[PDB]
């Protein structure tokens, strides 16, 4: 439930005798955790809110100019000086002008001309700082079992902040899922500013919100603003000798939009900013999970397919059954079988133990299950009233292993070293791989990783040729980098 149709879900199975499993949660998909004798739980990261951000250095992308003025001097006098150069609200530019004996000053050298124009910025952008504290994640989890396909004992919501990283989700009758999580190290919110232009908010990397050539204030907006650049958005174009002219460049809001690329959008509610693209790593201490249904007597009245058979994107099969004759809280017999002569259970039933909880007249329940690759029958019911459905699965285990390796490669390309923590009950091989991946990742991000799609495809083709025809012992080295680089393109 709640991860059936996500199409980016992965199954985390097994544990150290029921102690705990490490799991990384992502905004895109969700994780269904299934244990030996514990109810399958679907866990998803929903929203990340950032709170009380602090304004830093707001820019101007639309200038407006005002009453120009100018002053000229004797070809041989000092330099022009307007009294409006002693005002930090004017842009002033000094140049040389052809002058003399026609304009009014007897001499013929170049003069000196100063032009000043008042500056006013309309609707300038603002970035704000994000501390890795006061940052909240909201995790939604649900349980399989009795919920039909459509205070409720089966779903929980957990708020996790650096000030309280550990929480227990109390699922009534199922016990409680303990959940220890790491909120700080999630997405490295120590280089990302929150940027607004006009009701559109982005996540922006520092070193891109400091190398912007636009008039910038700094922090406290108190009275008549003071813009530091003062020259970029105003163009002092000058005709030789005769004229000086001041124009403003226009509105800049489209040049920023294209400068933003690879920056994440966000949306803001009140003083808080919700990001919908994130990354979180929680350890799941599932040793207080119980099975509600056991000790029930299995239901023997009849079962009817209501929704018949549905296949998810990953191979599993969802079934929605309706139970006719009221027994009570009562167990559902269900299995995958081939050779209906001898009902030998095959495949795996990924739902804990389906149980109907209602006792009114007719009840609805949804289970799902992981059938074998060949043809098979979904068999539901006890005897002489067993409904069977015929189900066919596509691909042999080899294709499954290949798709698993592809998923692992994509998860690594997205997460870095953190990917080694997805199914990380934790050994020594896993830890060693994580360490060497940390080292190689630091090296790679320090050498490359100032490049974009096209740039790295170029340098990848280049080093492919190089490693191909170098003929020394470094060839492999070259070749290795190329996989990395190229893999980073063909996974976006």
């Amino acid at each position, epitope marked *: 439930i709640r991860c059936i149709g996500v199409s980016n879900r992965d199954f985390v199975e097994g544990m150290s005798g029921g102690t705990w499993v490490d799991v990384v949660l992502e905004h895109g998909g969700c994780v269904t955790v299934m244990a030996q004798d514990k109810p399958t739980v679907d866990i998803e990261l929903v929203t990340t809110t950032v709170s009380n951000m602090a304004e830093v250095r707001s820019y101007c992308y639309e200038a407006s100019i005002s009453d120009m003025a100018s002053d000229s001097r004797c070809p041989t006098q000092g330099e022009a000086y307007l009294d409006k150069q002693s005002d930090t609200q004017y842009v002033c530019k000094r140049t040389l002008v052809d002058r003399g004996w026609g304009n009014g000053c007897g001499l013929f050298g170049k003069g000196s001309l100063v032009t000043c124009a008042k500056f006013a910025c309309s609707k300038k952008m603002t970035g704000k700082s994000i501390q890795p504290e006061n940052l909240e994640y909201r995790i939604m989890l649900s349980v399989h079992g009795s919920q*039909h396909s459509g205070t409720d004992e089966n779903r929980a919501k957990v708020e996790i902040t650096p000030n309280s990283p550990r929480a227990e989700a109390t699922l009534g009758g199922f016990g409680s899922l303990g959940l220890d999580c790491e909120p700080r190290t999630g997405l490295d919110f120590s280089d990302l500013y929150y940027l607004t232009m006009n009701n559109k908010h982005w996540l922006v990397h520092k070193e891109w919100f400091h190398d912007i050539p636009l008039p910038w204030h700094a922090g406290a907006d108190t009275g008549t603003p003071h813009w530091n650049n003062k020259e970029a958005l105003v163009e002092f174009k000058d005709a030789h000798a005769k004229r000086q002219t001041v124009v403003v460049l226009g509105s800049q809001e489209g040049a920023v939009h294209t400068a933003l690329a690879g920056a994440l959008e966000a949306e803001m509610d009140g003083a808080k900013g919700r990001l919908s693209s994130g990354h979180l790593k929680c350890r799941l201490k599932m040793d207080k999970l119980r099975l509600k249904g056991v000790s029930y007597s299995l239901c023997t009245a009849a079962f009817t397919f209501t929704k018949i058979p549905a296949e998810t994107l990953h191979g599993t099969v969802t079934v929605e059954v309706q139970y006719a004759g009221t027994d009570g809280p009562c167990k559902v017999p269900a299995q995958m079988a081939v050779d209906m002569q001898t009902l030998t259970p095959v495949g795996r039933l990924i739902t804990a133990n389906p149980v109907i909880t209602e006792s009114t007249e007719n009840s609805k329940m949804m289970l799902e299950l992981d059938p074998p690759f060949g043809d098979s029958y979904i068999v539901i019911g006890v005897g002489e009233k067993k409904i069977t459905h015929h189900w066919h699965r596509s691909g042999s285990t080899i294709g499954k292993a290949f798709e698993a390796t592809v998923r692992g490669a994509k998860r690594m390309a997205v997460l870095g070293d953190t990917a080694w923590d997805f199914g990380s009950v934790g050994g020594a091989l896993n830890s060693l791989g994580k360490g060497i991946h940390q080292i190689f990742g630091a090296a790679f991000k320090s050498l490359f990783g100032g490049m974009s799609w096209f740039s790295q495809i170029l340098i990848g083709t280049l080093l492919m040729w190089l490693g191909l025809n170098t003929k020394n012992g470094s060839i492999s080295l070259m070749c290795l980098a190329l996989g990395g680089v190229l893999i980073f393109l063909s996974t976006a």
Partner: antibody
Amino acid sequence: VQLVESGGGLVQPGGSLRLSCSASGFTFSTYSMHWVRQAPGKGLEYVSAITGEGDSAFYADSVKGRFTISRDNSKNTLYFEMNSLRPEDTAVYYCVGGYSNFYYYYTMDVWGQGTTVTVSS
Amino acid sequence: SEIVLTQSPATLSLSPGERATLSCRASQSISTFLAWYQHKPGQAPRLLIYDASTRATGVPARFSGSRSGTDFTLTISTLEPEDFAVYYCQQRYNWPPYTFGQGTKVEIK
């Protein structure tokens, strides 16, 4: 959890009108809103809808072009600005709301009391 | 074109306590997304059943819903006096175009 409708009254053919629907008791932004009208001695007619976030809007062919649905999640108010009214629009309008996680889909809904809109003749 | 729902009985006349059966047929396949509403004069329409067999919150157990292909059925075992009203079926399929059946009136014969 309640929806209070208002703005109904008498109008001339070709005239205009604006109906409002104030929501209470729930997170308005998570609810897709719908307008359903019933002519006198006629069955219910699903005429308009808007998503929870206001992104997209849907109009039935019978009203497509003349009526405009909108919503303000800060004031928790749904609006059905109906222009170019015809005598065929004389009916009781209900605003309904349902918790939506997808563009317009909902399972359990909540209805208002309805408001009568009568064209003069 | 648009899906249409056809309710068979235009008006139904029954004595109190009698069994009541109403049928709604769709013009095309809809898996289980059918709703049943009860509407009384001078009142807002009341949701009775969603997903064609699931009773809404607080609806008494006497109302039941069933499906067979494209034919949906609303059944009232023990008719009570407060149950005589108009009953509509509404389509909850993929996109917002939703059609209410023409309705069936349950009358006290």
